[PDB]
């Protein structure tokens, strides 16, 4: 019919399952950060699917140069040095949503199963992040088994966002400081999850074709 011009590069995802062991929510510690493991919990809330910036592409405001494949950290990121030798722009850019690649993104909140709660104890909770085709695979009230990587998410408000003014434990949750971006503020952290797989524990012609 026609020659499609928009054939970008697939964004593959690797999903692992069938790990030897499955961890409870209460057994998540900080020694396993950045490692691959599975956890089990009953979903309680699910966010809405939003587009997440993955490979931003900007253009220089003055010489109209282009920057492609700008890996994005937990906060909005822009280039610091134009590739044009004659250019002097360092902190002036405009995003280009046509060339930018976005990924789906959903936030799922889970809590430990009832039978695993010590008697008369409030439940523990966690926030799981799904991406790509693993979105909307968990409905509230289900007992799922996520498999991903335990990560730590910084408080992006302190790190410095465009157009955002920065800002249980009785003041003892003091973060780390001294970073260049953090002038006089501190950076506090949270434990999160990045699932790559989800399992939920709990017309004649068309029908015939399905059967063996």
């Amino acid at each position: 019919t026609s020659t499609s011009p928009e054939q970008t590069e697939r964004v593959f995802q690797i999903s692992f399952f069938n790990l030897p062991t499955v961890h409870r929510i209460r057994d998540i510690r900080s020694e396993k950060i950045g490692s691959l493991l599975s956890i089990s919990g009953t979903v309680t809330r699910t966010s809405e699917v939003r587009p997440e910036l993955y490979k931003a592409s900007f253009t220089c405001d003055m010489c109209r140069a282009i920057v492609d494949n700008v890996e994005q950290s937990f906060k909005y990121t822009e280039p610091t040095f134009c590739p044009n030798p004659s250019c002097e722009n360092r902190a002036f850019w405009t995003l280009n949503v046509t060339r930018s690649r976005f990924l789906d993104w959903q936030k799922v909140r889970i809590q430990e199963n009832a039978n695993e709660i010590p008697t008369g104890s409030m439940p523990r909770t966690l926030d799981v992040i799904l991406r790509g085709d693993s979105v909307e695979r968990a409905k509230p009230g289900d007992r799922c088994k996520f498999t991903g990587v335990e990560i730590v998410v910084p408080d992006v408000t302190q790190l410095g966002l465009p157009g955002v003014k920065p800002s249980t434990t009785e003041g003892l949750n003091s973060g780390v400081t001294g970073l260049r971006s953090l002038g006089v503020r501190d950076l506090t952290y949270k434990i999160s999850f990045l699932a790559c797989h989800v399992i939920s524990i709990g017309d004649q012609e068309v029908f015939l074709n399905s059967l063996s």
Partner: protein
């Protein structure tokens, strides 16, 4: 020859020589070719009849001083497939080109139309693919989508700046105007001349404004999975689209799915997630039309200039007043009185304000008081399908403030406000109440004022206002004990009281009696209907033809044509009583009163004297006649007198029928 003025061909347009579709469309020569092809499509397209569709659509557009040309997606897809593909994938630039070409086509017919409206907005009607608010993903970004939902929150109409002009704080130079994107603000960081990092002041000698409004779309309860929470999105309605949709209404929004940067969203989520909105391009009212989904256009109750040159042949014929009654719920076997009452209520009377001091209701209310399996709820559902604006309510599923209006505290402004209920949604429409006799007494007494004065008065939480509820009520009820007792009077067979009963223009009592011949006909008709409706019993043209053949068997007038006809009659025709036999009406009214003096009989008041005239006006309206005729008054008198006689007891029914035979 200037290279910028050269053009390609259609096949040369199908093969793309850019890295993205937007860049392909934006090129000069490609844009010229696309504009030429769109103009050719507008000028040359012909439907089956062979007459131009969009020439007539432009003529009517100019007639009404409107600035919106409705274009069918299917027509464009058939005439030009590549252009439809481009519009689907890159809607912004394609819509810009199509607006320019549409203005050029409109100026063809009205040379100086630029003096009425500067621009014409093209509206897409039937996008083949429909999404939900749960099914929207990143792949749909910057592409045309069609979604449904319920307008749960609306804002006032604000004049937005079409062009913003900036001036340097230091240099003082004034930058040229720049197009404003409703999705997000426009800012200038690097000045072309001053080259100053400092902000530039926002100022302008003269600007043109456009209307702006925002609505919060929410998933309709019908589509959301049972028990789950509903998703929602935000839609931006620019000029000519503001106030088309109202709170509490279903809608079908066609627009562009767009995303922009939001700092707060990134701060709360912790990831660089953008905010998404829909830029509305058209709206279709889906409320109360669940049974009309098989229909083209953004309005299914609107007419061309050729469909109302024939609603006026159908109506000069001599028996339209009775082919219309036949076409009311043809899938119901009998019940001629019920169908006549329903038709009268659908067409309705003419409201009149005498000297600006006296207000007289102009709508007809009907009550069906029958036995269990007598096709009442089906009639109510049909009336819901056919009426322009209808709302369905059931006995205990409705509240006193659910009908009429309620008072809430706005979550945003934290100030008391007023919401419209069923009767407000049924303004200039029909409110169908089923299980009328099982309602709560408190809820039932709420509609008294609305059923006669056509207004709702609220004095609550510092609000003192009166609304408009110009709605007719068709209610179905079940007699005491579940089965009508013909030996007792009507008053004893229902729990309603005189004030509520007197507000119903027509009372239709239905009885289920075992007559072998009557049972024979009804069963034959029902079984034939079940055979007819069986699912198994060009492709679109063939489907339409078979549907038409199936429909013709039981309805003399097509249902869609009938809907358009009823809407046209209710909009454009206001019959007036000039020549009438006063003595006849006076003498029938006096007879009705004297015969109704009996205890337990159906109440008779001046309301029914006025109901006779209302029904006569409705019958005159059915013929698209500007003056009420003697035959119409005779028919209305017959309707009222019969409806009165049928409600009598068995013992006196024969005497009453003999006494009233003069008028029937």
């Amino acid at each position: 020859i200037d290279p910028l003025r050269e053009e390609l061909t259609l096949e040369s347009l199908s093969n793309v020589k850019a890295n993205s579709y937007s860049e392909w469309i934006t090129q000069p020569n490609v844009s010229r070719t696309i504009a030429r092809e769109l103009k050719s499509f507008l000028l040359e397209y012909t439907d089956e009849t062979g007459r131009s569709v969009y020439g007539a659509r432009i003529r009517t557009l100019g007639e009404m001083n409107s600035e919106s040309l409705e274009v069918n997606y299917r027509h464009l897809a058939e005439s030009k497939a590549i252009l439809a593909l481009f519009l689907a994938k890159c809607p912004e630039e394609m819509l810009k080109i199509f607006d320019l070409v549409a203005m050029e086509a409109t100026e063809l017919h009205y040379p100086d139309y630029a003096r009425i409206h500067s621009e014409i907005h093209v509206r897409i009607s039937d996008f083949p693919t429909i999404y939900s608010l749960r099914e929207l993903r990143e792949s749909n970004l910057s592409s045309l989508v069609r979604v449904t939902g319920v307008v749960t929150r609306r804002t006032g109409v604000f004049p937005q700046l079409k062009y913003v002009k900036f001036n340097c704080l230091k240099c003082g130079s004034i930058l040229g105007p720049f197009f404003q994107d409703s999705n997000e603000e426009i800012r200038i960081s690097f000045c072309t001349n001053c080259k100053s990092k400092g902000p530039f002041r926002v100022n302008g000698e003269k600007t043109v404004y456009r209307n702006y409004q925002r609505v919060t779309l929410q998933e309709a309860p019908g589509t959301v999975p049972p028990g789950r929470l509903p998703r929602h999105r935000e839609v931006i309605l620019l000029a000519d689209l503001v106030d088309v949709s109202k709170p509490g209404e279903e809608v079908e929004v066609t627009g562009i799915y767009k995303n922009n940067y939001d700092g707060n969203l990134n701060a709360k989520n912790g990831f660089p997630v953008f905010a998404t909105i829909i830029e509305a391009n058209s709206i279709k009212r889906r409320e109360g039309n669940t049974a009309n989904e098989g229909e083209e256009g953004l309005d299914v109750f609107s007419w061309t200039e050729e469909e109302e040159r024939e609603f006026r042949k159908i109506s000069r014929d001599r028996g339209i007043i009775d082919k219309i009654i036949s076409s009311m719920a043809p899938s119901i076997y009998g019940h001629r009185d019920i169908k006549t009452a329903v038709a009268c209520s659908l067409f309705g009377g003419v409201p009149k304000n005498v000297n600006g001091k006296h207000s007289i209701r102009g709508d007809i209310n009907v009550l069906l008081l029958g036995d269990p399996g007598t096709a009442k709820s089906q009639i109510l559902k049909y009336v819901e399908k056919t009426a322009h604006r209808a709302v369905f309510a059931t006995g205990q599923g409705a509240s006193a403030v659910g009908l009429t209006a309620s008072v809430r505290k706005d979550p945003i402004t934290k100030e008391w406000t007023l919401e419209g209920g069923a009767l407000v949604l049924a303004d200039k429409g029909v409110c169908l109440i089923d299980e009328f006799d099982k309602m709560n007494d408190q809820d039932r007494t709420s509609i008294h004022e609305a059923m006669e004065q056509q207004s709702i008065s609220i004095s609550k939480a510092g609000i003192v206002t009166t609304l408009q509820a110009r709605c007719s009520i068709i209610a179905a009820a079940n007699p005491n004990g579940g089965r009508y007792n013909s030996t007792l009077p009507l008053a004893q067979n229902v729990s309603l009281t005189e004030p509520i009963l007197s507000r119903f223009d027509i009372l239709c009592v239905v009885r289920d009696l075992v007559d072998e011949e009557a049972d024979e006909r009804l069963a034959t008709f029902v079984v034939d209907s079940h055979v007819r409706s069986h699912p198994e019993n060009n492709a679109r043209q063939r489907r339409l033809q078979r549907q038409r053949k199936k429909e013709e068997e039981i309805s003399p007038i097509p249902q869609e044509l009938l809907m358009k006809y009823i809407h046209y009659a209710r909009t454009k025709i206001y019959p007036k009583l000039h020549q009438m036999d006063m003595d006849k009406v006076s003498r029938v009214y006096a007879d009705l009163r004297r015969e109704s003096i009996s205890t337990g009989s159906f109440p008779i008041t001046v309301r029914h004297l006025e109901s006779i005239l209302r029904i006569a006006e409705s019958f005159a309206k059915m013929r698209l006649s500007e003056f009420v005729s003697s035959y119409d008054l005779d028919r209305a008198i017959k309707v009222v007198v019969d409806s009165f006689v049928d409600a009598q007891k068995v013992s006196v029914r024969r005497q009453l029928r003999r006494s009233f035979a003069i008028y029937t």
